[PDB]
């Protein structure tokens, strides 16, 4: 696999999960997860990935 | 930055512990959010490595 291909899986791996768009920004307490941008983060109530119930949205930075 | 090949080793660079560079970021530290460490290299940390902010908790993550 080349460096270009690569690189596009690994951008690709890093955008918000619901919108594809932004990149992702938010951890889902308690689960742990990282799902979600900032914006799309506000339309979740459980986490799209394990459903459970998300009781804090922690902004991240890199 | 510079070229494809350093793109590529950033973003493999970024998903490693800042302290040990030697696996993955498992943690996040609440309440500054920053992502620094793997689970071993933040059990001695009661303040963030990169801003100095008590943390609260530290709340395990997925990273792959
Ligand atoms: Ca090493
Ligand atoms: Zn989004
Ligand atoms: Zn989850
Ligand atoms: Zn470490
Ligand atoms: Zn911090």
């Known amino acids: 696999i080349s ?3 690569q690189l596009r ?3 690709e791996e890093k ?3 619901i919108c594809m768009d ?3 920004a938010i951890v889902f307490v308690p689960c ?3 799902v979600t941008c900032k914006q799309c983060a506000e339309a979740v109530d459980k986490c ?3 459903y459970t119930v998300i009781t804090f ?3 991240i930075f890199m």
């Open 22 to 24: 932004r990149n992702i």
């Open 3 to 5: 460096t270009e291909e």
């Open 15 to 17: 955008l918000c999960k």
């Open 48 to 50: 799209p990935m394990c």
């Open 9 to 11: 899986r690994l951008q």
């Open 32 to 34: 742990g997860h990282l």
């Open 57 to 59: 949205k922690q902004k």
